[PDB]
């Protein structure tokens, strides 16, 4: 099946990451499809908001980027493919950050690397009891890649006057779970998993009251 599924909920558009075995690891195919489809939705006048979720709902939302292929694209010296991969991923992150319609991310499960990039750049990011949030790039010889260095110095609530809690999270790669992520500001809302279905229906129903401007 396609690695990303696109569906409709009466006004919202649902984007489901659809790679269960690899824990929704993000690719260049996935990033390109998401980027182009979000570009389409940005023009549609019948779209009000986008929901980002995963089919592998409990275990993972997005367990990082699929940087193993990036590492094989560099063992075989195919550096152009790694460049395309990161261009797609980071252009997608830039799109999500600057999107003019609401984007709602369901961080139900593991949320790491590319997952944080998908979820951290939206004002509406929902953690659950299953949210396992982390930024584990220091141990694979890589850097915070998805705009985390821009977001975390700004969104984190506690002990972040000079980005020092952001630095702690980035450098240590500590796994922040559930309501701790909500309390630190890594998530904007905290909703139980059992409710995310009903919420998804509600987000599909609400429309701007009049003059139909969802922006």
């Amino acid at each position: 099946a396609p690695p990303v599924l696109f569906t409709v909920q009466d006004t919202a558009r649902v984007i489901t990451l659809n790679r269960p075995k690899k824990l929704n690891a993000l690719n260049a195919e996935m990033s390109e499809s998401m980027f182009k489809t979000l570009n389409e939705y940005a023009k549609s006048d019948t779209t009000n908001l986008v929901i980002l979720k995963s089919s592998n709902r409990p275990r993972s939302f997005c367990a990082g980027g699929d940087v193993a292929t990036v590492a094989i694209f560099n063992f075989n010296k195919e550096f152009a493919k790694s460049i395309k991969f990161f261009t797609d991923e980071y252009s997608l992150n830039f799109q999500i950050a600057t999107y003019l319609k609401p984007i709602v991310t369901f961080m139900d499960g593991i949320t790491m690397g590319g997952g944080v990039g998908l979820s951290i750049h939206t004002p509406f990011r929902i953690a659950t009891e299953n949210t396992k949030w982390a930024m584990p790039e220091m141990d694979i010889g890589f850097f915070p890649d998805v705009g985390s260095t821009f977001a975390l110095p700004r969104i984190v609530t506690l002990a972040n006057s000079n980005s020092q809690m952001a630095l702690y999270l980035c450098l240590t790669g500590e796994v922040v779970t559930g309501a701790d992520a909500y309390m630190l500001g890594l998530a904007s809302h905290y909703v139980s998993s059992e409710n995310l279905d009903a919420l998804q229906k509600r987000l599909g129903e609400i429309s701007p009251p009049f003059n139909n401007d969802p922006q």
């Binding site: 509600r202 129903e205 609400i206 429309s207 009251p209 009049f210």
Partner: protein, 233 residues
């Protein structure tokens, strides 16, 4: 009753009034309702799992998934007439909630009918405030009754200290008896010790029953005499 339209669209009709000019002033609720839309679907929604016991609703087992002879020795080689009937109604019927404890609640009170005479309060205090460790039966904030026995039984089962529900239930029963005997001895000895120090009680339970029986029996005597006299005439 027909699904009503005019209760959930008060905003739209009000806005038509306002745009036309039929209504001059915006109501106080207008912006509030505009910012908080009502739910206006009113659909029937299917369900695919029984909440209580975890049974899956809406799965058909295929003949390929029954490759072994049934209890009568016959293989299943084609669907039966039940499998061929659309079972969409089950998806919408509110499922019956089931708990093994209820089978075990019925047993206890069949074995102890006089435990039904112990009054029970169904008014909840706060279900969220309960923090019980069912490694023991007595709990602070709870009475000792059949539910203590059954919760202890379920605890013993989920920790696999017993494999069979019967043995766990019997163990809980004997702990319950141990606690009940202590309570009754406490009551009796407390009364005895109270009398030995000059506690003067008024009416006891026996005298209470005697006086109520007397109150009833006076009226009964009067009615009997009146009826006999009437019958004689």
């Amino acid at each position: 009753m027909k699904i009503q339209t005019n209760a959930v669209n008060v905003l739209q009709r009000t806005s038509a009034y306002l745009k036309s000019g039929l209504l001059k002033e915006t109501p106080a609720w207008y912006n509030v309702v505009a910012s908080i839309p009502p739910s206006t679907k009113f659909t029937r929604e299917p369900r695919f799992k029984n909440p209580s016991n975890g049974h899956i609703i809406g799965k058909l087992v295929d003949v390929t998934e029954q490759p072994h002879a049934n209890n009568k020795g016959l293989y299943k080689t084609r669907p039966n007439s039940s499998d061929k009937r659309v079972g969409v109604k089950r998806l919408y019927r509110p499922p019956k909630l089931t708990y093994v404890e209820d089978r075990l609640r019925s047993l206890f009170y069949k074995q102890h009918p006089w435990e039904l005479s112990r009054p029970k309060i169904l008014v909840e205090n706060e279900i969220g405030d309960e923090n019980y460790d069912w490694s023991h039966m007595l709990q602070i904030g709870r009475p000792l009754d059949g539910e203590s026995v059954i919760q202890r039984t379920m605890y013993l089962i989920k920790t696999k200290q017993y494999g069979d529900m019967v043995e766990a239930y019997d163990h809980a029963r004997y702990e319950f008896y141990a606690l009940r005997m202590q309570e009754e001895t406490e009551q009796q000895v407390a009364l005895e010790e109270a009398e030995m120090f000059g506690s003067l009680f008024g009416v006891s339970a026996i005298e209470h029953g005697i006086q109520k029986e007397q109150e009833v029996l006076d009226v009964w005597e009067k009615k009997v005499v009146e009826e006999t006299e009437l019958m004689a005439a």
